[PDB]
Every structure is written in structure tokens, then in C-alpha cells.
């Protein structure tokens, strides 16, 4: 526990930086009203990637205001620019009449319905194409439909970089997740019974509370997966019920085919945002498991070196423990003629 | 360039007895080695008499290139090429 | 030992804020690591009170 | 293993410092010299590929052997899996896979486009193979920043540098 | 680089083969040992184009042994890097000597002295990686280096890239 | 420190050769070297030097009623099954019965449970492996004869369509190498395929 | 070989483009020397250096270790160095097999353990 302690104490030297990093960027961003979710999970941020969740997030809603800090060159293209166009383009209004950010993040947060969804009045292709069409200046759009799928994947994009669903999907994956394996061709013709890999050919939903008991088959689970042979997966036996429940939240109340637009167009980019959520999830978990088995093979290594190096010397009898025995030591090697 | 066409081949139409002597033992030697024998063998089993028996039915899928002194040559297949 | 260990810690002279989070955040990582431990104490020893 | 049309190179006395290889100094050694010649002899140019080029052209090859083995009755991890060895359908897989994740023109009629562009261009004539080959491939957007990669093109000043990269930007698929 | 090349493969048969499909056997027999492998002369051969239409002439009978000899000329497709040339990648490792990225099938390591300064390796990082303020490098990062030196093998190529110039590291 | 640790059998026997319990106990296949023979029992020795004996009952199958000596000799190294271990005197008992060194083949302890292994999965597999054994590889027939021909039964009905009636053709037959088909012109537009069953063959391309 | 950086006096060093470094004279083992990495471990030598050697260990791993570190080499007599197919057959060193599944390689047998 000890060597726990020292360990614990570089991880938290090493991510102190980190979080002083974070704040300091904060604070060049300046914000006339302190952002409330940015409070609420700098205050409950423990792990780096929690600190990196913070970042995505401050970068994505304040991308011109960073983008402006880091000019306050280079070409490099800026992933957020398409973003900040349509903040500038007139079609941001209809991304802000499908839900309040404000509003989206205090239901979050809460867990149940505080405010209801006001479904706009006409429907996302009616506002598209009449603001297309009374703002063909401004509109960068060519078609209807590519504004739609820009607001879309806007909205997805909005939706991914929430705090506090990559937070629940995270405990989620944490607290219920199971391990899945699957095989290459390298894979399906490498794994011969008499290979150590054999073991996990063919598990599944693999408990991932039940491996840190037994970090050797996670590790060697990795090692086939780094020779090309396995693949690792982790899913969630109730994924749909997360998935059901923050729609329920997101989702309007309206009957309309209006709302059933609205409601069809969130949903979308709902599902769109979990897709892009997933695999940053899936690695997180991933490298903690490994970080946990790793801690334990390293304490199983140090107990077993431990033992195998705690012996007295020989005590002749009629001495007290401690003394140096004369020793006379005879051997032939091998033995053959 | 170096090849001589069909048309234009000027050598003697005949199998000199070296082309048949190292024809009959490079024959032997692929047969020895296992390789397909184009005829129907009765009894025999020496690889030398296989490749004879082949000679004479001409059934040799080999290809003689005389060499002309100033370094051109002409391709003759041993099915076409006339043996005493 | 502890040279090595914090040759890469540029920072190690820590605040005291930030020596009470670091403080505050190793029991937590504790607790986290050690909930068989603590939780078969408390059950075993439930007569004493605050233990953990 | 395999040996170049070029052969002979026998030992002589006068060392050369155009030997070494060197893509800064356009110095790409005799068995990729400018001037090649076919298994007829004749005069040959050296053939430089760009990634698009590149890809077409294995994209193309690899169908056509999987159409003729199957009697002549698209996916890029079949298409790998039709080659055989295993070290071979590795490479095949990591070169498919550098190739679509840096495939700067995925249709046809857009890399002929491109190619008729940086050959027919009369600024173009002089330019190396191996030059249009790395502006074609690294999708280079400044001039500046083109003649810090591409150290050659910085004594080739009689380029219309900036209107050939952005008329590539715009054949260049956003 | 990619290029195109007329080659040249001698190629041996045995005479348990001399039988009618002698030339597709043949093709195939090229193929398989040619696609995929790796020349430090030539660099990298990827593909054999018209694979299937390959003129293999006339075999030449070795006197002593029986065998025939072929001579196969063909065209093929030939990637190789060049001193001095800058390139795209993907990381494929992280390391404290330095990192492995993967410029198709060939694998160049970057050592932490052809690294600009600002990029500190960051083990606690998940994944570990060479990061700076504004710049963050990983496993599958796409990152632009130039080969700066090629190591020949008997079958393999090794190279070493470097980031430390201008219009290199992250993209 | 504690007091000095003296090892044991399980110890002893690892250190002395170089094989752990757990590779070499009951229920094991080894390849064992013949180092005598006689009537009631044979003395093997293993890769480890560990002397072996096998009581007269299983060298030979229970069926056979021949001699240890005629089918076994020295210098004869034979599969053999593990049966006990003396781990003290590194004596171990050996069986040839084909019903350990044959059957025994998932000798791994691996928890099969389908909640946790995909068994579906592995046997799918099974199958695909044991069909590509099953897949092998035929090449024609060749035969010379001024009446045989390389033809189909199509092909050979056309040849013989130009020629009058009563020629005959002769051509290989579906039913195996050691069968020939004949095709005889019955009459115009009419042939017969009469199958012929080859005995004695001495090579497959001969007659 | 060891693949990590040296500083060593321009005074030593030559331009010399090739390498081809040859290991005799040196240590105890040479190449394909079937060698005992520890307790537990045993490997093949599959490349020499002239500071370590390259094991490859019956698992399909690739190792590093200093000669000393090595036990020592498994001098296994033919009594001891046997073979047995699956069909039972016997088969010595040098001989060639062929996989019976899997990729179905072929090669000649260079050393046999367990």
C-alpha cells in the first residue's frame, strides 16, 4: 500500500499539470457567464480523461473564441471550421430552434424532464428552404438537403460533445460492460489448441469485474490482439435502455408531423453522436482495465520475487539462527561415462 | 533479330548424331526425373530405351538451336527434324 | 529512488490547495482500489467506529 | 532476386558524386535514371506514380485478376484477400490501406484530368516526373510551403506554382 | 515512391511440371514470388500488371541437371523511399526512444532527437504520446515526415524519418 | 528471514528434470524411446530420462495374440500414454492402448460453458477445416491409342457425326480413371457410350 | 543491433554503407543453437550480435538477452532429440514435413524439443 501511495502520488504530480493547463485556458477564454457544466465537471474531475472530455468540450463550443486565443502561420486546417460556418451561416437559428443548449444540459443533468422541447412551428425542410431561399446571399448551402444533413451532423456533433453522456456512457461501460473477442484470418488459422491464445478463441461477455482477479488472461488477450489475431470488444447487454433514456429526455413532445420531423431529425443525430461516442468509450475502458491488471501482475511479480528471495542461511544445530555454516558442496555435472 | 525465321532455315534438315546422342540422354535424364512420357510404355523400364522408343515415334518435346557462327541461330523441334 | 521518480516531475513543490486535492484525491483512489479490503474490515470490525 | 534491363556496369576509375541517392538533389540513381529503355530497347522515360495514379492502377490490376480467376463472372479487404501469400496479402493489405486513408482523387476522370494538367501545361514540359508525383501526392497549398518540401521546384521559378495547386485544390474533392 | 518498371525473373522448373498447363503454372509460380516482397535494390514490388498474359518464351534446358530455365520479363508496380523526402504516415507505436509510424508496407522509426523539443513524451496520457500545447501525437495520428536515412536488409528496408523541419510533425 | 527452504518432491523432481507436475502427470502423450524388450513387459525410456515400464497387457492390443518382441524392437520409439508417476523415484508407467494416445485429443481443461464460449462458432469452424481436408485435387487422363480421343460425350457424338456409321471413338469415362467409355455410331444422329471397368491397371494414364 | 543511440568520437567511426557483421569468436552460442533461457523458458538463436543474441522461444515469441544471462546450451543426444509424426511415424533431424492443417508450410526440422 505504500508503493501504492508513491504511485498515486506521481499519477496525481503527473495530471496536476494537466488541470492547472485546463484552468489556464479557461481563463484566457474569458467567458462573461461562467459556464455551469464546465464548473460542474472541473469541480468533479478526477481522471485525465474527464480533463480531455472538458477540453473537447470547451474547444467545441468556443472553437472561434480558441481559434482567436491561439491567434491573440502554420495551415493547418482547423477540424471545427465547417462548424464555425454554420454558427456564422443563417441556418444556425434553426440549430438553436431545435432544442436549447441551456435547456438540453439542465434535463441532462437532471435526469428528468424540467423543461419541455417546443417543437418549432414548421417543419425542418420548411425552415431550411425558406431560409435558403430568403437568404440565398448568405446561405453557402447548394441544396435543401445538404443544409439538413449539415444541421444534422451539427447537431450530432453538439450532442458527442456533452460532458456528461460520455460520462454516463462511461460508468456505464465501467460498472455493467462485458469483453467480447473476435478473430482475424490470422486469427481464425494462428489459434492452434496447444497455443497459449486458445484460452479466449472463443469467449464471450467476459465480466470485466472479474478480470482484474485474473490480469494474465487480459494481457495476454491484448498480446493476441496487438499480433493482428483478436480483436477485443466491449458492449453493453442494456445499451438500447441508455440509448431509450436519453432520447426520452432529448426527445419532444409533440404529435405534429412538424414534431414528428423534429423529432426524427434529433434522433438521427442522437444515434449519429453515439456512434462517434463509442469508440472513445470502448478505449478508455479498455485502458484502465489494462492499467488495473497491470498494477495487479506488477504486485503479484514483487510478492512472488519477494518470496523467492526471503530465506535465512542454513542454521546448524545447536547455533543460534543467523550464524554462517562450513559448507562443502560436491557435484559431477552429468553422469555419463 | 538473332533468330532465323522457319521460312529462311538453312541447316541441314537431318539429326546429326550429336543432337541425337545428347537428345536421348537429356530425354533419359528428364524421364529419370519423372516427367510425363508422351508414349506407351509395353515393358520397358530403362529411362535410356523410353526415350529411344520416343525418338523413333517422334514424340521428343524438345527443341535443337543451332548455332550459326556469327551468333544467330535456328530453332528446330525434334518432331520435325528427320532421323535415320 | 524518489530522484528517479520525479526526474520527469518538472513541478513537484505543490501548493497547499493542491497538496490538500492531491491529499484528498489518493484517498479516494484508495478507497476505489481497496473496497474488498475496507468493506471486509468494516463487516469484520463493525463494533468500532470509523474505521475507514 | 529480380534484375533491371540495365545491365553491364563494370568496374572503371573516376568516382562520381551523382550516385548517392538523394530526392532533394533529383539524384535517384541509375536504375531509376530519365531515360529507361523497354524489353525492345527503346527509348523509355522514367515512370513516376502519384498515390491517386497509384491506386487506380492497383485497384484496376487487382480486379481484373479476381474477375479471371472466378472465369469472368470491390472491396478493398477482398480484393487483398484474392492475392495469395500470407506476407504478401499483408502488404497488399498495408499499401490498400495507405492508399485509400491518403487518397487525395478517388474517381477516374478527376486524376486524368490532373495528370493532363501537370503534363500538358507548358510551364509542366520541364518539370521532373518525380516533382509532379509529389505535388500530385502531397497536396501541397502554398508555394512556400511546396518549395520547403519540395527543394527542387525553388530553382524552377518559371512555374505557375500557385494557380496549378489551387486549380488542384479545386479538382481536389472537399 | 510509386513507380512503374520492366523487370526480369529467372525462373527454374523442374521436369515433374513439363506437362501442358507448364506456362500457367509458371505465371502463377511468379506471382507468388514476387508479389509482396521486398528488394533493397528495387525497394517494394506491390503488384505484377497484366498478370495473367505474361510471355515466359522459350525454356532452356541447364545440361547435367534436366531442369529448364526460364526467363521472364514483366511490368510491375515498385514503391521506394528516397533520402530526403517528405511523406504522409500513421503512428503505429508510441515510445520513450521515439515513435513507429507506417508509410505503407514500410515501417520508419523517429527518435527523440529528430523530435522538436515542445512535443514531450507524455506516458500518462491515454494513449501515451509525444505531445506539445497545440500539437498532440498518438497511435493512428496522421503525421507528414521527411526519410532522412535508409538502412538496406536482406529482405527488408528500414528507414528513419524526422519532424523537426517546417511543414512537418502532426496533420 | 525465514529458515532455509528445503525442497520437496514436487521440487526436487522439476529442478532434476526440467519438467513440471503439471506437463507430466496422468493422462499424457508422450513420445517415449524403446530401450528393451521382453515377453511381459518392455523398459522405455522418455525425453527427460525418466526410466518407464508397461506391464505385458498393453503393449499389444487385448485383440492381437502376437509377441511384444515381433512388432516392437529396440531402437523403436512409439507414442505412449502416461498412467502413474513416481515423482520420488522418477518411475512412471506408460500405456500403448490406442484408447489414450488416439483418443485423447482436447486434453485442455478449458470451461466450455456457451454463456461464456461460443461453441457454435468452433465447431463451424470444425467443419470448414475438416471440408477443406477433404478437398483434394484431379488432373486428366492421358492415353495413346489410334482410336482415343480427349473428347466429351458431346464432343465425341459430333466427331463421330461426320464419320459414317460403325466408326468408334474412345475416350476417358466419368466414372474414374480405372473406367473408359467407347462411343460407337449406332446410326445417323445415334451413338452408344458403353462404359469399360479396367483391372490390373498399372498406372492410372496406363491401360 | 541494439537499436538505440550511441556517442561515440567522430575518431571512431568510418563511413562504411554496408554492415555484414559476422558473430564468430564471440560468446558461447551460435546461430540455430537450441538454448535454454531460464527455469522455464526455452528457445532457438535466430540472429547474433556481438553485445546480445536473439532467441526465438517455443511460444513464437521473439526475446533479447545477454549471452551470460542464458542457461546454457541443450546438448540432447539422438536418444534424446526424437520426433514422432502423427501417424506415429518416427522422424529424425533434417528431415522434411509438411502441416498437416493450418497453413499447410513444409520445412526441415532443425531442432526437436518435447
Redesign the interface.
Known amino acids: 500500500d505504500l508503493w501504492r501511495i508513491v504511485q498515486l502520488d506521481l499519477d496525481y504530480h503527473s495530471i496536476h499539470d494537466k488541470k492547472a493547463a485546463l484552468s489556464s485556458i479557461y481563463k484566457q477564454l474569458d467567458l462573461d457567464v461562467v459556464d455551469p457544466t464546465y464548473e460542474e465537471f472541473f469541480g468533479s474531475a478526477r481522471t485525465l480523461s474527464e480533463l480531455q472530455d472538458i477540453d473537447d468540450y470547451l474547444t467545441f463550443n468556443y472553437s472561434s473564441q480558441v481559434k482567436n486565443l491561439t491567434a491573440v502561420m502554420k495551415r493547418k486546417y482547423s477540424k471545427y471550421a465547417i462548424y464555425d460556418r454554420i454558427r456564422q451561416d443563417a441556418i444556425y437559428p434553426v440549430v438553436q430552434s431545435i432544442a436549447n443548449i441551456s435547456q438540453m444540459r439542465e434535463n441532462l443533468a437532471q435526469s428528468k424532464r424540467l423543461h419541455q422541447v417546443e417543437d418549432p412551428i414548421e417543419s425542418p425542410m420548411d425552415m431550411i428552404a425558406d431560409i435558403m431561399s430568403t437568404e440565398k446571399d448568405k446561405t453557402t448551402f447548394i441544396s435543401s438537403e445538404k443544409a439538413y444533413q449539415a444541421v444534422k451532423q451539427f447537431f450530432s456533433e453538439q450532442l458527442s460533445y456533452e460532458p456528461f453522456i460520455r460520462k454516463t456512457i462511461r460508468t456505464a461501460f465501467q460498472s455493467f460492460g462485458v469483453i467480447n473477442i473476435e478473430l482475424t484470418e490470422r486469427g481464425k488459422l494462428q489459434i492452434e489448441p496447444e497455443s497459449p491464445y486458445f484460452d479466449f478463441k472463443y469467449a464471450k461477455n467476459r465480466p470485466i469485474s472479474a478480470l482484474t482477479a485474473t490480469p494474465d488472461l487480459y494481457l495476454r488477450m491484448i498480446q493476441a490482439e496487438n499480433d493482428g489475431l483478436v480483436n477485443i470488444k466491449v458492449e453493453l447487454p442494456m445499451l438500447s435502455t441508455v440509448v431509450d433514456h436519453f432520447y426520452n429526455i432529448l426527445k419532444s413532445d409533440g404529435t405534429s408531423e412538424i414534431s414528428e420531423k423534429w423529432n426524427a431529425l434529433r434522433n438521427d443525430a442522437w444515434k449519429q453522436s453515439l456512434d462517434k461516442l463509442i469508440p472513445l468509450v470502448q478505449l478508455n475502458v479498455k485502458e484502465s482495465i489494462r492499467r488495473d491488471c497491470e498494477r495487479v501482475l506488477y504486485f503479484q511479480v514483487k510478492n512472488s520475487f519477494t518470496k523467492k528471495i526471503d530465506q535465512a542461511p542454513y542454521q546448524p544445530p545447536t547455533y543460534a539462527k543467523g550464524t554462517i555454516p562450513r559448507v562443502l558442496t560436491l557435484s559431477f555435472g552429468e553422469g555419463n561415462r | 533479330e538473332l533468330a532465323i525465321l522457319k521460312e529462311e532455315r538453312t541447316t541441314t534438315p537431318y539429326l546429326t548424331k550429336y543432337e541425337r546422342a545428347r537428345i536421348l540422354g ?1 530425354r533419359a ?2 524421364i529419370s ?4 512420357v ?4 509395353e515393358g520397358e523400364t530403362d529411362p535410356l530405351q523410353i526415350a529411344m522408343k520416343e525418338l523413333s515415334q517422334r514424340k521428343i ?3 535443337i538451336r543451332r548455332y550459326l557462327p556469327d551468333g544467330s541461330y535456328e ?1 528446330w523441334g525434334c518432331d520435325e527434324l528427320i532421323v535415320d | 529512488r524518489f530522484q528517479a521518480y520525479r526526474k520527469s516531475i518538472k513541478n513537484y513543490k505543490l501548493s497547499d490547495v493542491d497538496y490538500s486535492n492531491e491529499r484528498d484525491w489518493i484517498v479516494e483512489q484508495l478507497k476505489l482500489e481497496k473496497r474488498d479490503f475496507l468493506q471486509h474490515l468494516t463487516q469484520a470490525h463493525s463494533s468500532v467506529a470509523h474505521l475507514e | 532476386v529480380s534484375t533491371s534491363t540495365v545491365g553491364a556496369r563494370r568496374r572503371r576509375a573516376k568516382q562520381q558524386v551523382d550516385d548517392e541517392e538523394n530526392a532533394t538533389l533529383l539524384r535517384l540513381g541509375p536504375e531509376f535514371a530519365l531515360k529507361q529503355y523497354d524489353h525492345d530497347g527503346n527509348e523509355h522515360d522514367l515512370i513516376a506514380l502519384s498515390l491517386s495514379e497509384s491506386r487506380l492502377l492497383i485497384r484496376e490490376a487487382l480486379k481484373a485478376r479476381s474477375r479471371a480467376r472466378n472465369g469472368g463472372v470491390i472491396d478493398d479487404d477482398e480484393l487483398a484477400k484474392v492475392t495469395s501469400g500470407a506476407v504478401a496479402n499483408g502488404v497488399v493489405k498495408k499499401t490498400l490501406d495507405y492508399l485509400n486513408t491518403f487518397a487525395r482523387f478517388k474517381d477516374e476522370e478527376t486524376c486524368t484530368a490532373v495528370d493532363q494538367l501537370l503534363h500538358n501545361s507548358s510551364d509542366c514540359s520541364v518539370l521532373h516526373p518525380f516533382e509532379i508525383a509529389q505535388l500530385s501526392s502531397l497536396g501541397c497549398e502554398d508555394v512556400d510551403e511546396a518549395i520547403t518540401l519540395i527543394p527542387s521546384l525553388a530553382a524552377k521559378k518559371e512555374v505557375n506554382l500557385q494557380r496549378i495547386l489551387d486549380e488542384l485544390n479545386r479538382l481536389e474533392d472537399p | 515512391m510509386f513507380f512503374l518498371k520492366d523487370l526480369s525473373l529467372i525462373l527454374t522448373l523442374h521436369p515433374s511440371y513439363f506437362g501442358p498447363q507448364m506456362n500457367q503454372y509458371l505465371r502463377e509460380k511468379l506471382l507468388t514470388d514476387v508479389e509482396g516482397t521486398c528488394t533493397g535494390q528495387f525497394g517494394y514490388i506491390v503488384t505484377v500488371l497484366d498478370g495473367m498474359n505474361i510471355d515466359v518464351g522459350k525454356g532452356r534446358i541447364i545440361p547435367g541437371s534436366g531442369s529448364a530455365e526460364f526467363e521472364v520479363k514483366y511490368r510491375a508496380v515498385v514503391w521506394k523511399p528516397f533520402k530526403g523526402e517528405v511523406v504522409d504516415a500513421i503512428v503505429s507505436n508510441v515510445s520513450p526512444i521515439g515513435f513507429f509510424a507506417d508509410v505503407g508496407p514500410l515501417n520508419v522509426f523517429v527518435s527523440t532527437r529528430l523530435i522538436p523539443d515542445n512535443l514531450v513524451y507524455n506516458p500518462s496520457n491515454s494513449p501515451p504520446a509525444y505531445m506539445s500545447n497545440d500539437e498532440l501525437i498518438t497511435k493512428g495520428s496522421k503525421v507528414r515526415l521527411k526519410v532522412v536515412g535508409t538502412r538496406t536488409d536482406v529482405n527488408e528496408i528500414y528507414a528513419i524519418g524526422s519532424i523537426k523541419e517546417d511543414f512537418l510533425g502532426a496533420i | 528471514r525465514r529458515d532455509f527452504h528445503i525442497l520437496n518432491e514436487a521440487e526436487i523432481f522439476q529442478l532434476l528434470t526440467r519438467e513440471t507436475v503439471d506437463s507430466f502427470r496422468k493422462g499424457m502423450v508422450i513420445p517415449v524411446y524403446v530401450r528393451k524388450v521382453e515377453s511381459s513387459y518392455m523398459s522405455v525410456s522418455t525425453q527427460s530420462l525418466i526410466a518407464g515400464n508397461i506391464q505385458r497387457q498393453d503393449i499389444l492390443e487385448p485383440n492381437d495374440r502376437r509377441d511384444p518382441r515381433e512388432v516392437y524392437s529396440v531402437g523403436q520409439t512409439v507414442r505412449a500414454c502416461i498412467l502413474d508417476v513416481d515423482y520420488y523415484n522418477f518411475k512412471c508407467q506408460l500405456s500403448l492402448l490406442r484408447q489414450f494416445t488416439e483418443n485423447q485429443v482436447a486434453g485442455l481443461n478449458v470451461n466450455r460453458n456457451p454463456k461464456f464460449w461460443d461453441i457454435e462458432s468452433e465447431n463451424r469452424d470444425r467443419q470448414e477445416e475438416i471440408d477443406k481436408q477433404r478437398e483434394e485435387s484431379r488432373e486428366s487422363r492421358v492415353i495413346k491409342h489410334p482410336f482415343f480421343h480427349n473428347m466429351k460425350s458431346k464432343e465425341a457424338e459430333d466427331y463421330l457425326a461426320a464419320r459414317p456409321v460403325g466408326d468408334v471413338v474412345i475416350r476417358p469415362s466419368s466414372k474414374g480413371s480405372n473406367h473408359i467409355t467407347i462411343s460407337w455410331k449406332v446410326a445417323p444422329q445415334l451413338y452408344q457410350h458403353i462404359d469399360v471397368l479396367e483391372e490390373n491397371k498399372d498406372d492410372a494414364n496406363a491401360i | 543491433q541494439t537499436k538505440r543511440t550511441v556517442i561515440v568520437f567522430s575518431n571512431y567511426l568510418i563511413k562504411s554503407t554496408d554492415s555484414t557483421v559476422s558473430i564468430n569468436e564471440s560468446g558461447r552460442f551460435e546461430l540455430h543453437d537450441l538454448v535454454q533461457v531460464n527455469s522455464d523458458l526455452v528457445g532457438i538463436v535466430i540472429r547474433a550480435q556481438k553485445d546480445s543474441f536473439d532467441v526465438l522461444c517455443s511460444d513464437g515469441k521473439l526475446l533479447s538477452l545477454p549471452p551470460v544471462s542464458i542457461y546454457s546450451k541443450l546438448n540432447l543426444n539422438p536418444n534424446q532429440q526424437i520426433a514422432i509424426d502423427s501417424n506415429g511415424v518416427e522422424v529424425k533431424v533434417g528431415d522434411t514435413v509438411r502441416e498437416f492443417t493450418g497453413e499447410r508450410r513444409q520445412g526441415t526440422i532443425l531442432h526437436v524439443y518435447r
Not at chain 2, 526425373?33 to 510425363?36: D, E, L, R, S, T
Not at chain 2, 508422351?38 to 510404355?41: A, G, Q
Open positions: 537429356t535424364l528428364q526425373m519423372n516427367a510425363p508422351l508414349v506407351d510404355i518435346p524438345l527443341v530453332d
